[PDB]
From Swiss-Prot:
It is found in: Secreted. Belongs to the glycosyl hydrolase 84 family. Residues 77-132 form the Dockerin domain. The gene is nagH. Transmembrane segments: none annotated. It comes from the Bacteria. Putative virulence factor which is likely to act on connective tissue during gas gangrene. This is Hyaluronoglucosaminidase.
Length: 140
């Protein structure tokens, strides 16, 4: 069963984008995700079922398949992206960590989306988590 790299990287691909949704919190990404993970598909599926999807197209189509899904996977406000500082703190990372670079493709370690640019996609969660963090007095 050829097209392994494809059928193995795409099966989940079209199932990810079709499972995920652009929203603004855990389980939903901001925007620009539905494309990447699909762009790899549009380019992969065309290979998955391609005839020349031999030794030339597979690896050629798996490239973005192994790097595009890995991206979108952390686009839906990574189930645990809240840890912007990377040490375990969700309160200032929005007004000190993420908002700091905003639009930087070097510090993707704390981008709810991981689109390589601290933008709205990365503020969505905190912006909400901050407000609806507690209802007693303060502190987590």
């Amino acid at each position: 069963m050829d097209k392994t790299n494809l059928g193995e990287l795409i099966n989940q691909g079209k199932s990810l984008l079709d499972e995920s949704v652009e929203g603004f919190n855990v389980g939903e990404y901001h925007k620009g995700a539905k494309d990447g993970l699909t762009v790899e598909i549009n380019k992969a599926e065309e290979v998955f079922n391609k005839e020349d999807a031999t030794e030339e197209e597979i690896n050629l189509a798996k490239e973005s398949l192994e790097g595009a899904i890995a991206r979108f996977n952390s686009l839906l406000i990574e189930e645990s992206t809240g840890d912007f500082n990377g040490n375990g703190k969700i309160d200032i990372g929005d007004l000190a960590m993420v908002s700091k670079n905003i639009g930087s493709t070097t510090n993707t370690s704390l981008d709810l989306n991981k689109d390589g640019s601290i933008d709205e996609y990365e503020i969505s969660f905190i912006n909400h988590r901050i407000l609806n963090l507690e209802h007693h007095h303060h502190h987590h």
